[model samples]
Target: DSNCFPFTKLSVQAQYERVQREFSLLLRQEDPRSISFATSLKNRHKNRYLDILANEATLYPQVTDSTPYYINGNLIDLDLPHKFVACQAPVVQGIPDFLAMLYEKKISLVIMVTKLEEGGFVKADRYWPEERGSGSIAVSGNCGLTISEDPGKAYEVEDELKITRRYLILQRADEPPHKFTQVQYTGWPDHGIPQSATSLEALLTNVKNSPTTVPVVVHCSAGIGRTGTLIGAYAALTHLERGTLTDTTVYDVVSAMRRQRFGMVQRMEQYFVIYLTLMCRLGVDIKALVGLLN
Candidate 1:
């Protein structure tokens, strides 16, 4: 499902060259939006207008946006038949809307990229049950949830890798219960990637294998940098497995995400790490890959 496309038809060298040429363009590309927090009367804080892109299939005029959960979010499509939702963390005011988005979209996975408070500054509004078995939360008037102690048991700690997962059960007034798997990628700094993405890479497998019944919800504060890095790495690694790992593979996914949310991969480090992580997954000596580039 590699949208990097013709790269699959090209030699690795050609693929690399094409990808190298696209980097600078990514820095300059502009995707501007007209909506702003200054213009809205209510729920102004719920939506982030700048980088948020409109869903082509469900434009505002057609829907007229009745709910506050009409967030600054975008749906990301991979080469496969699945899609993931990348968005900003809900504010205390919009936590209900966040739950609504989950209910309406049938999201099964929520990957939180930032801690509730990182280094003293608040990053995300605490929305879920804090303890593994802390029980349900009245997240919205329409939706309520009761999460047991990692019901699905998605985590397995070992010396080589550590990924935190919580299996939650979310219910809505109108619908039956929903099973949610939330992954908190510990040791992942709020700003940049880790020293080795190998562990994160290992986590991606779980993220990918996660049920595809609904789009996975991914967020980190403003919801692009770390969020994009994770999604970009997912798409890139998918490309690699499909025999389409070209030089353009990393940026192709980055650029695609940008088209959806403007500045999806915000930093060069994030952009660069996608490649690094993919190489690491392929068994390339990460250090050796850097030397080759140098």
Candidate 2:
């Protein structure tokens, strides 16, 4: 293995091949039980199914399917301890449960990786406030839900739809306002990986810049492809940034996530995206990152 930059040196095409081999390796070495033992899937499941193969409830760092307002999701704890609850986007019926998870878990950041509607198709479910709205609007499943756009926070970002810094307040009756900061990333095609890892890294940086380290909820459509890619990138990058390998490779990261939630890096491209993001962020010279062996 070539130091910290082994993954960076490989082209997207090459990484794609390597990642597939790695994932196949996972299929052979990984456990189907780690995912099926969860309470949510205790019934039955597929790739698009939320929490399709999450680890058992006891393995979750905090919440579980047993909790009220719970959604199909699983946790991935890390050394950065920026532990993440990667989940599927909240659908209309699951909105209340989504809110409850954030409130009870005290989640500080919501990192959205997919658009609610893509090319007029329903890609993700709306669960928060929109930027162009006149004022705060309310939607609820469990309790009173009010999402207000912070005018001050508006005009603060360069990205369209105000991706830079959008401040929203999620309030429930008889409960304190849950201050929510969201980083919405558009441009990634559904079921596909980004052409470049730079923007994704910025979105991730936005999540890390937020105040709370409790648990960040990251989602795309199925919470497997892009969701898994991001988590895998973060886990490995955490080690690289600290200048300590400690046996943290892209394979290890992907395997760890699959252990919690199956099929983390859904597509071949998505798997390679993890390696790409880490390599780009490290600003590693590709020439030095060259790998003689895959």
Candidate 3:
């Protein structure tokens, strides 16, 4: 039985060595360099990239099954029926398709944000029509729908997408919520900590209140940094809940995130931002949280 179940019966060091060896074999086969190169180019162009590379493609040969994918501690797949759709910035042409996908999936609540208009309108035009029309679902007060101004007033679109509630939308400087039916947003120009946290809080709140086990959707201009940060935070929290480890470093967390979402947290700075945000939430000293440790 011990030989048959090496993982269960092996000593700690032996198990670690086995895992390392296996990982090396898988790494050579899957070629993390290629994956990293592709993601780098896509991000450099400021395009609205998707997580398909990590989630759909078998980039990690070690991950023979999808179970270990999530176990790596990232959300490679939010588990939505529609794979992905890209809407060009400044003109949301895919709204219809987004709406169709939502209708097909029978999803009710839809959340989105665009570069705030010069006057403060969330630029849904940057997305496709399918994304906008999907908001037409019959939900009271748009409890299922909301939008952010990026730097302006935060508002929730309600009344079948007609009436919007614009109020003193504070910046989300914490881990933005990831527990929403669906979430979409334009990339934050700077790492606006306040705005990010607010968005994450809403997502988590929505996920908690959702009727079904709904998965959240998040997208920015490139769907990597800000988007990845929010997704990573959620996945990290989930891992903590599962009693993974107390010393699971942010890199460990992000390594797991990249496994699921491809270049989920691409930039090095973004990773730092995530760690700072987490520490801030836990009441860590913000001023001293600058350089990488270990």
Candidate 4:
């Protein structure tokens, strides 16, 4: 039931024209306007670890009608209650809580969109299993969980733009372990997106193939820029895969996501990349589209 862009009710080429026109304008703006349908007033403490402070554009989790999702006895479905959770990178102080959320939610994938260090600044803290004697890391909070990196499972993919790794999470000695994959996209620059679309589309294919019942967690530095871009791209691309692109645009996906989580897609270039990537995957001649754009 999403609204179509201003016009183009019947023509695909018209829509492409509009998309390119919008993208061209976005490219010229010093600060492109991003959409946000709500604000973050509560849970200020929950977001204190961010390098950037939460503001009106910050997104807070929602409480759904289903049974509440809790982590370590604290009700958290309100903070993360969707197929995807966009959040800041885990800080050293909040590692326990982060693990607890992952364990409780049965998350099957975590998409990291930023590097740990970028241009002399630390964007995110290291939280996953690192080199160690046991290759396993344990944590304690309201719950106890252990994460072990699957040996020899870490490798580069999609032309080294992404690195994928498998991990096993154990909640108890008597319980079966939970397995998940982390796909860290190294191609997305700190303040921008990838110049090409194939790398991101490959990553999106991995995200699409993940388990359907559980949520996928995506994060960057502040979690709303790069994170939001990937999340928006995923949702819009899913629609494209389903042959339902006629009714929805990238704007529709971003708008819906922003309603759920404020500022889901933060910049116009980010917005443009989502469309570019989807168009390329759909077998459209982007060279012609660029010709039209120019």
| Candidate of highest TM-score | 2
- State residue 217's C-alpha deviation in candidate 2, in Å: 0.9
Tens digit of lDDT per residue, candidate 2, span 62-166?
A: 344244444667777655658788877766766766777776767888888877787778878776665566658766566657777765566246453324456
The lDDT, on a scale of 0 to 1, for candidate 1 is 0.64
Count of steric clashes across candidates, in order: 1, 2, 41, 0
Tell me how far candidate 3 lies from the true structure as C-alpha RMSD in angstroms. Answer: 13.4
Candidate 2: C-alpha lDDT: 0.66
> How much lDDT does each candidate structure score?
0.64, 0.66, 0.39, 0.60
Q: Give a tens-digit lDDT track for model 3, residues 171-277.
A: 12242322113444433443443233445555544544544433344444344555566655655544444444244444555565555555555444455555445
Query: Could you tell me the lDDT of residue 121 within candidate 4?
Result: 83
lDDT (Cα, tens digit) per residue for candidate 4, span 1-294? 342323324255775666666545433442223532222223334453322333333232333223222111111122222377777776665566677667666778888888898889887877676754477878765456688876656433555555555455546456677777887877777666574576677667777788767777888877767887887777766665555664446766666555555444566556666766766765654564445443
- Residue 247, model 2: lDDT of 34
Across 1-294, the per-residue lDDT of candidate 1 in tens digits comes to 443334335455554454455666787675354433222224345654443444443222213245534555666776554567777777776677677666565677888877777778777877767565446567534445333344545444344544566776667665687666777765666655564566677668767787876677888877888888888888887776777776566666887787666578766656666766766665654564344344
Candidate 2 or 1, higher TM-score: 2
Candidate 2 vs candidate 4: the TM-score winner is 2
lDDT measured at residue 160 in model 4 versus the true structure, 0 to 100:
56
- Candidate 2 total steric clashes: 2
Clashes of 3: 41
